[PDB]
Every structure is written in structure tokens, then in C-alpha cells.
Amino acid sequence: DELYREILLDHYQSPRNFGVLPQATKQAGGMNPSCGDQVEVMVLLEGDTIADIRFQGQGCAISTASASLMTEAVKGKKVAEALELSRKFQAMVVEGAPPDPTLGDLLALQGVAKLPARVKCATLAWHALEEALR
Amino acid sequence: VLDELYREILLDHYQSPRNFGVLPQATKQAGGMNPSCGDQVEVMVLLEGDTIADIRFQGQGCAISTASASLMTEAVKGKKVAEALELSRKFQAMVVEGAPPDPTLGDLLALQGVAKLPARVKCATLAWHALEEALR
Amino acid sequence: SVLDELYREILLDHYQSPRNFGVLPQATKQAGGMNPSCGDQVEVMVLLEGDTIADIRFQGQGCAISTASASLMTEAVKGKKVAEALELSRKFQAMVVEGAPPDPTLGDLLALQGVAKLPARVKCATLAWHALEEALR
Amino acid sequence: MSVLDELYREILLDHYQSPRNFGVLPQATKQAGGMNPSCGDQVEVMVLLEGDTIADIRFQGQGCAISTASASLMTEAVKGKKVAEALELSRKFQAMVVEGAPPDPTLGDLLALQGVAKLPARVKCATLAWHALEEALR
Amino acid sequence: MSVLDELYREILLDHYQSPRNFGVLPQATKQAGGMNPSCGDQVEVMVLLEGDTIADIRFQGQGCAISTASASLMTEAVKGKKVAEALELSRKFQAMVVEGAPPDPTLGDLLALQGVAKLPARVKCATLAWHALEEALR
Ligand SMILES: [Zn+2]
Ligand SMILES: [Zn+2]
Ligand SMILES: [Zn+2]
Ligand SMILES: [Zn+2]
Ligand SMILES: [Zn+2]
Secondary structure, rough: OOOHHHHHHHHHHHHOOOOOOOOEEEEEEEEEEOOEEEEEEEEEEEEEEEEEEEEEOOOOOHHHHHHHHHHHHHOOOEEEHHHHHHHHHHHHHOOOOOOOOHHHHHHHHHHHHHHOHHHHHHHHHHHHHHHHHH | OOOHHEEEEEHHHHHOOOOOOOOOOOOOEEEEEEOOOOOOOEEEEEEOOEEEEEEEOOOOOHHHHHHHHHHHHHHHOEEEHHHHHHHHHHHHHHOOOOOOHHHHHHHHHHHHHHOOOOOOOOOOOOHHHHHHHOOO | OOOOOOHHHHHHHHHHHOOOEEEOOOOEEEEEEEOOOEEEEEEEEEOOOOOOEEEEEOOOOHHHHHHHHHHHHHHHHHHOHHHHHHHHHHHHHHHOOOOOOHHHHHHHHHHHHHHOOOOOHHHHHHHHHHHHHHHOO | OHHHHHHHHHHHHHHOOOOOOOOOOOOOOOEEEEEEEOEEEEEEEEEEEEOOOOEEEEEEEEEHHHHHHHHHHHHHOOOOHHHHHHHHHHHHHHHHHHHHHHHHHHHHHHHHHHHHHHHHHHHHHHHHHHHHHHHHHH | OOOHHHHHHHHHHHHHHHHEEEEEOOOOOEEEEEEEEOOOOOOEEEEEEEOOEEEEEEEEOOOOOOHHHHHHHHHHHHOEEEEEHHHHHHHHHHHHHHHHHOOHHHHHHHHHHHHHHHHHHHHHHHHHHHHHHHHOOO
């Protein structure tokens, strides 16, 4: 709908779930020395569900929007279902895999496939998440 | 241009969704969840007789479900329950079926493009199904 | 082409933030319009300090075109002589209804020039103007 | 540039929506008016002069987005400048919009209206506020 | 060319309208001013040094949208970095906009100004803040 341009802008300027989790079950950071992106993901698990999740860090607009979108994409889902969006998303931008409708707002970051130099900027948050949920 | 205006309508509603929130003394509420996208919604309405005196929606999902929910509450607020149902059928005929858009849909016509996006049709109709469920 | 798409932005801006939206208690005259085609409704109120349209505002719920049109309408008419407003009304209708070459004198109104290609939406744009014409007398 | 052309468009839109220095100016040293009936634009420029410098300036009127944005951008470009300087900027501005000549960066945000050179029927919409300024300073 | 283009335009607009680290830096260790004699852009960069680390940095000035956005983006890019890392960024930024070199990925959000390279006469509006930074750090 090309309104995905707004999704990117919205999340870049108003990142969701940005901050610290008082009580967290899992936590893992990530960093990109080159661009200067850094993100730490905190997660609260209840059973096999991501009860709450938040991120912290600074970096380019792409990494900030990606972290925001990722937190919104997995909150309330099961760890398994979360790891599936991760592997998938990494496909949309790393291997240039084909788009997937079940990614919803995450689609807004397809173009990252192009300009493979910034792919690192978009997967930082997802790597941190997987390192947390493992 | 029509295409330019519809794009702008969807953006405006995604950015500033109308009637977002909760109704304190809601006559009847109803919730809804999406299987293919995982969109979740809940609609609350205040009825004075058979007129939707007020309505509100909350929850969240993709941009489409939010814009569609906003446009929906805007179109039915203050309207007769029967009118809300009339708009709902017209909307679904447009989005679900390839049916030629009913001109009385107004700004809801901006979501016409979803008709050619299955797996995304449920993102648009979620709010409407919850509304119907809320109106009994 | 920084300007080549300015009209679209002007139009989109008026849809988003329509001007003179509200009411004018004690308006010299008022008039309402409605086209069941799209389901639009409009209320026009004007301040006639004699022969000039001092202030003006519009009410009613309708689609984006009806909203933008009535917005662009009030901005193009406020503070102008009654006759001047009607002159613009004719020029505007000539543009959207008859699809005639838009009169450059229309200024910002040219933002709606594309409506001439939309038979099903012509009344959406002209509604605010017909209401204006009924009020102004 | 594309990204830059869009930044400029945003600048124009901003000045269109919220023009700067818009309104009457108390103690105005002088003021001049201008009309561009070809479009239906009208503008009034008022200046407060102190020596050879424009201490303050404002404009009023109504018209297309281009003329209003040109008026707003013009007030911001000359406020606090030397009368001769303002006139110099007006020279360069009209040279860009009327002669399509290569505009130097000393026009700054005014460069947003550079494309008007390719739009003969809009040149007067852009130059109106400046002719008024010049007449208000003469 | 349009996904990030859209985002880049937004970044520029946002930094120009709401520049970051804009104000006087009281505890400034060193500072330097830069000026584009013609465009009228002026900037002053103040840095608070702790060892070889730029602990804080702020800028002051007035000018065109490009110069403001650039100064804003520059302060964000170098705050918290070592002096040598800031000078490298400056070198890369100038290679991008002055030499038109293949934009170095490490520039991040600064890549939003890559397009200024296509407008030679406006390149000085983008580099002004960086020259002031370098002078302050010398
Ligand atoms: Zn990055
Ligand atoms: Zn959805
Ligand atoms: Zn209509
Ligand atoms: Zn004009
Ligand atoms: Zn400059």
C-alpha cells in the first residue's frame, strides 16, 4: 500500500517498547561497530509466551525502526512463533527471499534486501532477540 | 487524484485513528482476532435505543487493521444500528468479493485495494466482524 | 519538479486539515447541501458585512473530496465581493462539471482539476459551491 | 536532487501552511501592495527601517500557495539585512525565477522555488511579494 | 532509491526543523565558528572533551535548511566518539559530498545528505558544520 513508508517513519521517530524491563526473563545485546548501531533486547516470558519485550540502544533510523517493529511483531506471541518471524525476516533482507504476508508491518523493510550493506542495520534487533530466546 | 486521496486517507487514519480507546458505560463489547496476521481488536458501543450513540475500539495489529478500524468507527458513530450493518455489508462486498464498490461507502473506498490482497482481507474486515458481534 | 506535485500536496493538506471548519452563529445567511451518491452533507455559513463576504465556515460530514473542496472553497472566497465569489463558483464548476480548460484565475482551486475525470465524484466537489450559491443572495 | 527536491517541497508546504511574519506591522516605516489577477493573488509588504537596515518586516494578503510561501520565505530572507542587500537578493531571486539563471546558494531556502522558472504562468505568483518589497523600500 | 529516499527526506526535514544539540555548551573545552560568507550560513561548534572522547557537543547558528540539518546530524554522529573517530567521520562525509566518492556505509543517517553531491554550489552548506568541528578539534 506504499503506506509502509509511513510505518517506517512512524517507528523511526516514535519507537515502541523502548526502554528497560523492570523484571525480565531473558536479555541479549547486539552491536554494529561499523554503523554504530547498538541494541539490547529484554524479554519477559510466561510459559512459552513473550509476555513483554523492550529494547534499548542507539543507531541509524533503520536499526531503530527495525527494533521497534520487531518488538511489536513478537510481543504476545510464543517463543516458537517469534523465532519463525525472525528466521523469515532475515530471509526478506539477507538472502533476498520472497515477501511473506504474515510479516505485516515488517514488510515495510523489504527494500533493505537492496543495499545489502545496511542489512546489518535491520537484523541487529532480530539477532539480539534470538540470542535471548535461545 | 483519487489514488492520491485514498493513500492520504489510509495514512491519516493509521497516524491518527479516530475513536481509539475504551467506553466506560459500554452497552456491549465484542472482540476479534486474526489467524493469518495475528491482528486483535475489540469494539465497544453505547446504544440509545437502536442508535449508536458512541463507539470506541482498541487493541492493535498491522497498519491496515488500525486504519480500517478507525474508518469504521468514524462511519457508524451516531448512526442507526441498521445503518451500521448496511455499511458493513457494503464494505465486505467491496473487500471480500470483487463487487463494484458502493459509492455510499465514502472514505471507506480507500481500502478498495485490499480486495486484491488476500491474507490481507481479514486485516480489513476484522473490525467490522467485531462490530457486528457487538451489535448482537 | 519540486512544484510539479505541489497541487497534490495542497489538496492532500486541505483534506487532512480543512480550513474554516466550524460554525458562524449569527451568519448573514446559511445553506445546506447533500448528494446521496456518495453520502455527503454540507452546511455553509457566510458573514456579509454589506456586499463583501467577511467570514465563512462549513459543517457536515462527507468524503475527502467534499472536505478538501469546501476547505479550498472558503479560503478562495472569504473577504471577496459576492459577485467575485459567484464568478469563481462558475469558473470552478466549468472546470469540474463541463471539463473545460480550468480558468487560471482559480488559483489553488486547480488542485481539484482532476475531478473533471471522475463523473461519479463531480457532485462531491461542487456540493459546497452549490450551497454557497444558495446562501449568497 | 530528489531527496533534496522533496525537502524543498516540504519547506514550501510549511511556509504555505504557517507563513512567517504574517500580519500587520505596527510603526511600519513604509509599505507597498501588489496584485497578480492572472492568478488572483494579493499581497501587502510592510517594513520597519532603521538606517540602511530592515529592522522588521511582515506581509498580508491572500493567494496561491506559491505566492504565500514566496512571501513568507522572502520575509525570512531579508529581515535584519541592509536595504541594498535585500534588493540584491531580490535581483538574484528574480533572475532565478524569471531568467532561469543558475541560482547561487546565497538564496538558501528560496531555492525551493527554483522550478518556477519552468512555469511561465506562475512566475508572477513568486515574484509578487518581491516587487512589493522593492516598492516598499523605494 | 525511494524506500530510504522517503526516509532520508524525513530525516532531513526532522533535523532541520528540530535540530539536535542546538544551544550553548557551558563547559565547552574548545570551540570554533564557521561561516559561508555568501549563503549567510554561520555555525559555531562547541565540544566538551574528557580525555580523547567528545563527551558532549553542541552547535549554534542560523542558515539554510541544509546547513541546519547537517550540523544537527553531525553532532549526533560524533557525540561520545573519540576525537580520532570524529575526524575520520568528517573525512568520510566530505569524501561523499565533496569528492562524490562511493558513500562509506559507516556514515549511517548522514547518508541522507548524499544527494548534495549533485549540487556543487550547495556542498558548502553541508560541510560548514564539519569544518567548524575539525577546527574546534585542532
Ligand atoms: Zn545502522
Ligand atoms: Zn494484518
Ligand atoms: Zn463524496
Ligand atoms: Zn498565484
Ligand atoms: Zn546554505
